[PDB]
Amino acid sequence: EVQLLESGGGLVQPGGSLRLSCAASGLTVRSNYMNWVRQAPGKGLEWVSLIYSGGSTFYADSVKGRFTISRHDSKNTLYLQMNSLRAEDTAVYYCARDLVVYGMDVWGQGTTVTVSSASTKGPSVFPLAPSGTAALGCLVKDYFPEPVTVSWNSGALTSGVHTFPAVLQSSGLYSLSSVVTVPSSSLGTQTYICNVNHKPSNTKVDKKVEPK
Amino acid sequence: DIQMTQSPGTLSLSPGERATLSCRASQSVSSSSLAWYQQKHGQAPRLLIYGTSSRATGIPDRFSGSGSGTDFTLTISGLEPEDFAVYYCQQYGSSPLFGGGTKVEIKRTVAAPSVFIFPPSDEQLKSGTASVVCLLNNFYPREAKVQWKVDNALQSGNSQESVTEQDSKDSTYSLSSTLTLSKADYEKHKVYACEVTHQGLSSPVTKSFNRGE
Amino acid sequence: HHTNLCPFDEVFNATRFASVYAWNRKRISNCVADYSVLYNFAPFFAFKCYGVSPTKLNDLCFTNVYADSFVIRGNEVSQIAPGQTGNIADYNYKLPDDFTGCVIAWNSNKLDSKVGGNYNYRYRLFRKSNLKPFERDISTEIYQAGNKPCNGVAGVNCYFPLQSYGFRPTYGVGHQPYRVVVLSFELLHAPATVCGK
Amino acid sequence: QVQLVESGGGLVQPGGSLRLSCAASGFTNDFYSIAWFRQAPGKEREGVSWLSVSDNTPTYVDSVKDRFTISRHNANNTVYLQMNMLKPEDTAIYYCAAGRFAGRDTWPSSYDYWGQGTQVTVSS
Ligand SMILES: *[C@@H]1O[C@H](CO)[C@@H](O)[C@H](O)[C@H]1NC(C)=O
């Protein structure tokens, strides 16, 4: 049972602090090279910090003076203290055990850090009314932060569903659409409801989409 | 400071084909300091190859690595559906340094998009904002052009686009373009249209509606 | 009762050098040493002394002088200095923070790189804690990286601690071999046996 | 509290002269060393001249040996690099670097303190 499990990610305003955790099992953080590696939305992997078993620490230039890597030997847990956070620190943060010549063989699942002055807000859900096959959907507008989940007919409708990646609007709020194509013959006989869930704001919206 | 460059940015091949991914170092380095990682969409990276040519545990034989000094190559002898992902090389210098990554996408036959336009709902108009959505459904290749037209005026600077990942079943993409106006601006115009240009279309396709009809 | 030149030739011009994890030490005594000659030797692209100027060494007498020598790759030369961290400084050869000797280094690609690699030059990759200053660890015990004992068998979380450099002529200078000589000066409550000219 | 202040860069024609200066302050003794590194647009940072302060020993790479002179004025704690017979190959950003040791080293990573760098250009 060799695994890594991150936690502690969340939403912080610029200049704030956040502490990440990475609980190990099987391997021991006391005896390994351990890395933090982050990935900004739509970008590549960036190594961030490294701690030797002997205790030496190293940092990328982009985080020097602000981030601090450490560990708790008894709890078998790795930490990353992040101070003076900036918008460009928004990323998924992974911890990994480094074997150097044998590569980083063990990775966690990642924990998401979002740095923004925007306030948590639930989405407005508006119908995309239909007008062989017809297309309909839901517009999930003006929420923050990521993510939202969208299902159709409580999960009974999955075929032909396209839920698009959100776009960050100039207001700092996210917006996305979820669409589905169905036979036009079923518009008058089948209800279509999009089930929107935004857990950060505890928002649950069911929107029936009918022809206009 | 060593620099790692991966090419191409995107590799388009069909399943069953042989893939060759390039990773170049600005300095000639030992092969024991170069590793490869695979990252599928929405998932964490996983070690693929270490020491330039050694497969990590559980990695199938179709993955191989080679290279010496400055030019390193990842070879996939017969792409399987699960192999279409992003691949990163990584060099161990003063610190671990990842290349920019290469995405391996599925090359399929050309598929023209189905285009749909959605006017803003009456519910949204009550809030003072109007969003117009143009949908491009199940097309390939990924390259496409959406031109918003408002009373025949080409609209630029007030729309945003989003593209789904390649579909697991037909390997197509879909795109949504959202035109955002104030309610007061939306009421100043009659004809709203999106004109779609794509390799699968002999001429541009336009979907439109007249506001209030 | 004639005083001879110190055998620095046997250190700097040895046919082969030691691996850094098993670094060699030569105890030098009862001889005259010209340090300025070494200092003005141009191929020594790295010649650094701490708390003392290299041209002052010829005016000083010591009880003994120690010459440590080994091979590392080029981009690790900066770790052979006081206050350094990294795989070499931490796990292979450690200088004390208050070091007051000299560090000498030069490219040895022509001597130590081999077609097909020189895997006989090795370094310690895995170690649980840092070396003390001037500590030499030649253990080859399997390294336990997890909670399960290895019992001398490499496997999951059980790794051989040493790794080969594999020096090749086609590597860049950062990964080419560099020969290093560290001079330490010892002063005891005893007559001095090593002086400068 | 080590600080390195450089000046003296600029544009010159082939064969012209240029003098760089590096005012080093904050050291607690003379057992430090000053080096001039340069970095071409697409190449690596490479040292061209060195001066060990305590013993006042200069060192030069072979490509500048009869063209560059490094020296120190003790009054203003400034190390000067006189560059004569400049060639187009000399075009680069020149950095002053300081190392906490008496002597010389070709590796940039061996120097703990770096100036902001000054641009030197030789016109074709
Ligand atoms: C070491 O030997 C080489 C030839 O192998 C010679 O060129 C060099 O001068 C010698 N160094 C010294 C310090 O005598």
mmCIF file of N, CA, C and O in Angstrom, chain A residues 31-65:
data_model
loop_
_atom_site.group_PDB
_atom_site.id
_atom_site.type_symbol
_atom_site.label_atom_id
_atom_site.label_comp_id
_atom_site.label_asym_id
_atom_site.label_seq_id
_atom_site.Cartn_x
_atom_site.Cartn_y
_atom_site.Cartn_z
ATOM 1 N N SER A 31 12.486 9.101 5.015
ATOM 2 C CA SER A 31 13.567 8.414 4.324
ATOM 3 C C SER A 31 13.639 8.711 2.831
ATOM 4 O O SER A 31 14.459 8.100 2.137
ATOM 5 N N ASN A 32 12.830 9.629 2.311
ATOM 6 C CA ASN A 32 12.738 9.825 0.870
ATOM 7 C C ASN A 32 12.968 11.277 0.478
ATOM 8 O O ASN A 32 12.707 12.198 1.258
ATOM 9 N N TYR A 33 13.479 11.461 -0.741
ATOM 10 C CA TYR A 33 13.303 12.723 -1.447
ATOM 11 C C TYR A 33 11.818 12.917 -1.724
ATOM 12 O O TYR A 33 11.175 12.045 -2.315
ATOM 13 N N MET A 34 11.269 14.057 -1.314
ATOM 14 C CA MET A 34 9.858 14.355 -1.532
ATOM 15 C C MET A 34 9.716 15.693 -2.246
ATOM 16 O O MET A 34 10.384 16.669 -1.891
ATOM 17 N N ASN A 35 8.842 15.733 -3.253
ATOM 18 C CA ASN A 35 8.636 16.911 -4.083
ATOM 19 C C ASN A 35 7.213 17.432 -3.952
ATOM 20 O O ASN A 35 6.279 16.673 -3.680
ATOM 21 N N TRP A 36 7.060 18.737 -4.158
ATOM 22 C CA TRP A 36 5.785 19.340 -4.516
ATOM 23 C C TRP A 36 5.887 19.813 -5.959
ATOM 24 O O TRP A 36 6.863 20.475 -6.332
ATOM 25 N N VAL A 37 4.901 19.444 -6.772
ATOM 26 C CA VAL A 37 4.853 19.793 -8.186
ATOM 27 C C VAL A 37 3.456 20.316 -8.482
ATOM 28 O O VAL A 37 2.464 19.672 -8.125
ATOM 29 N N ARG A 38 3.374 21.478 -9.127
ATOM 30 C CA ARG A 38 2.089 22.119 -9.367
ATOM 31 C C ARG A 38 1.798 22.222 -10.859
ATOM 32 O O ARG A 38 2.686 22.086 -11.704
ATOM 33 N N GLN A 39 0.526 22.467 -11.173
ATOM 34 C CA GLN A 39 0.066 22.563 -12.555
ATOM 35 C C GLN A 39 -1.035 23.611 -12.635
ATOM 36 O O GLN A 39 -2.140 23.397 -12.124
ATOM 37 N N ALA A 40 -0.733 24.740 -13.274
ATOM 38 C CA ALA A 40 -1.724 25.781 -13.487
ATOM 39 C C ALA A 40 -2.760 25.317 -14.511
ATOM 40 O O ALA A 40 -2.498 24.405 -15.299
ATOM 41 N N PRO A 41 -3.953 25.918 -14.510
ATOM 42 C CA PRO A 41 -5.009 25.464 -15.432
ATOM 43 C C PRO A 41 -4.562 25.543 -16.884
ATOM 44 O O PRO A 41 -4.190 26.607 -17.383
ATOM 45 N N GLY A 42 -4.597 24.396 -17.560
ATOM 46 C CA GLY A 42 -4.219 24.321 -18.957
ATOM 47 C C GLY A 42 -2.737 24.412 -19.237
ATOM 48 O O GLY A 42 -2.353 24.553 -20.402
ATOM 49 N N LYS A 43 -1.890 24.329 -18.218
ATOM 50 C CA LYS A 43 -0.449 24.473 -18.380
ATOM 51 C C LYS A 43 0.259 23.180 -17.982
ATOM 52 O O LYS A 43 -0.369 22.176 -17.636
ATOM 53 N N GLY A 44 1.593 23.215 -18.037
ATOM 54 C CA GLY A 44 2.398 22.040 -17.783
ATOM 55 C C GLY A 44 2.788 21.892 -16.323
ATOM 56 O O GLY A 44 2.437 22.696 -15.461
ATOM 57 N N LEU A 45 3.537 20.827 -16.054
ATOM 58 C CA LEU A 45 4.007 20.544 -14.706
ATOM 59 C C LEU A 45 5.182 21.447 -14.353
ATOM 60 O O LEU A 45 6.088 21.657 -15.162
ATOM 61 N N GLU A 46 5.165 21.980 -13.134
ATOM 62 C CA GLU A 46 6.245 22.825 -12.640
ATOM 63 C C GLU A 46 6.674 22.321 -11.273
ATOM 64 O O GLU A 46 5.884 22.350 -10.324
ATOM 65 N N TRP A 47 7.918 21.858 -11.174
ATOM 66 C CA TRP A 47 8.472 21.516 -9.872
ATOM 67 C C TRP A 47 8.565 22.765 -9.003
ATOM 68 O O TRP A 47 8.909 23.849 -9.479
ATOM 69 N N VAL A 48 8.262 22.605 -7.715
ATOM 70 C CA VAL A 48 8.106 23.719 -6.787
ATOM 71 C C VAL A 48 9.077 23.616 -5.617
ATOM 72 O O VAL A 48 9.760 24.588 -5.273
ATOM 73 N N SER A 49 9.154 22.446 -4.989
ATOM 74 C CA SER A 49 9.955 22.319 -3.781
ATOM 75 C C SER A 49 10.383 20.870 -3.599
ATOM 76 O O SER A 49 9.710 19.945 -4.062
ATOM 77 N N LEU A 50 11.508 20.691 -2.911
ATOM 78 C CA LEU A 50 12.098 19.384 -2.665
ATOM 79 C C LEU A 50 12.709 19.371 -1.274
ATOM 80 O O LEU A 50 13.327 20.353 -0.855
ATOM 81 N N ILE A 51 12.533 18.263 -0.557
ATOM 82 C CA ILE A 51 13.178 18.069 0.736
ATOM 83 C C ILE A 51 13.885 16.719 0.731
ATOM 84 O O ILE A 51 13.293 15.700 0.356
ATOM 85 N N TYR A 52 15.156 16.723 1.123
ATOM 86 C CA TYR A 52 15.937 15.504 1.262
ATOM 87 C C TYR A 52 15.551 14.765 2.539
ATOM 88 O O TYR A 52 15.047 15.352 3.501
ATOM 89 N N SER A 53 15.822 13.457 2.550
ATOM 90 C CA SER A 53 15.714 12.708 3.797
ATOM 91 C C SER A 53 16.636 13.294 4.859
ATOM 92 O O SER A 53 16.275 13.360 6.040
ATOM 93 N N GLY A 54 17.826 13.739 4.451
ATOM 94 C CA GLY A 54 18.765 14.373 5.358
ATOM 95 C C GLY A 54 18.364 15.760 5.816
ATOM 96 O O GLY A 54 19.009 16.300 6.722
ATOM 97 N N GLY A 55 17.336 16.351 5.210
ATOM 98 C CA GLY A 55 16.783 17.607 5.677
ATOM 99 C C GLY A 55 17.004 18.798 4.771
ATOM 100 O O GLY A 55 16.357 19.832 4.981
ATOM 101 N N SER A 56 17.893 18.705 3.783
ATOM 102 C CA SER A 56 18.115 19.833 2.886
ATOM 103 C C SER A 56 16.862 20.114 2.067
ATOM 104 O O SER A 56 16.145 19.196 1.662
ATOM 105 N N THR A 57 16.596 21.396 1.833
ATOM 106 C CA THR A 57 15.432 21.831 1.078
ATOM 107 C C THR A 57 15.862 22.693 -0.100
ATOM 108 O O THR A 57 16.877 23.394 -0.042
ATOM 109 N N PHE A 58 15.079 22.628 -1.176
ATOM 110 C CA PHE A 58 15.343 23.393 -2.385
ATOM 111 C C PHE A 58 14.022 23.883 -2.957
ATOM 112 O O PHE A 58 12.979 23.245 -2.786
ATOM 113 N N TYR A 59 14.074 25.025 -3.639
ATOM 114 C CA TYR A 59 12.871 25.698 -4.103
ATOM 115 C C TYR A 59 13.072 26.231 -5.513
ATOM 116 O O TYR A 59 14.183 26.592 -5.908
ATOM 117 N N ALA A 60 11.979 26.270 -6.268
ATOM 118 C CA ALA A 60 11.980 26.981 -7.534
ATOM 119 C C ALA A 60 12.073 28.480 -7.279
ATOM 120 O O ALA A 60 11.642 28.980 -6.237
ATOM 121 N N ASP A 61 12.656 29.198 -8.242
ATOM 122 C CA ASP A 61 12.779 30.647 -8.106
ATOM 123 C C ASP A 61 11.420 31.315 -7.947
ATOM 124 O O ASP A 61 11.303 32.321 -7.238
ATOM 125 N N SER A 62 10.383 30.765 -8.583
ATOM 126 C CA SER A 62 9.066 31.392 -8.567
ATOM 127 C C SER A 62 8.423 31.392 -7.187
ATOM 128 O O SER A 62 7.464 32.140 -6.970
ATOM 129 N N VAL A 63 8.914 30.576 -6.254
ATOM 130 C CA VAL A 63 8.331 30.478 -4.921
ATOM 131 C C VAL A 63 9.340 30.739 -3.814
ATOM 132 O O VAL A 63 8.982 30.639 -2.635
ATOM 133 N N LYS A 64 10.586 31.073 -4.150
ATOM 134 C CA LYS A 64 11.597 31.308 -3.126
ATOM 135 C C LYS A 64 11.204 32.469 -2.224
ATOM 136 O O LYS A 64 10.711 33.501 -2.688
ATOM 137 N N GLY A 65 11.435 32.296 -0.922
ATOM 138 C CA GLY A 65 11.082 33.292 0.065
ATOM 139 C C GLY A 65 9.641 33.266 0.521
ATOM 140 O O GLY A 65 9.319 33.888 1.540
#
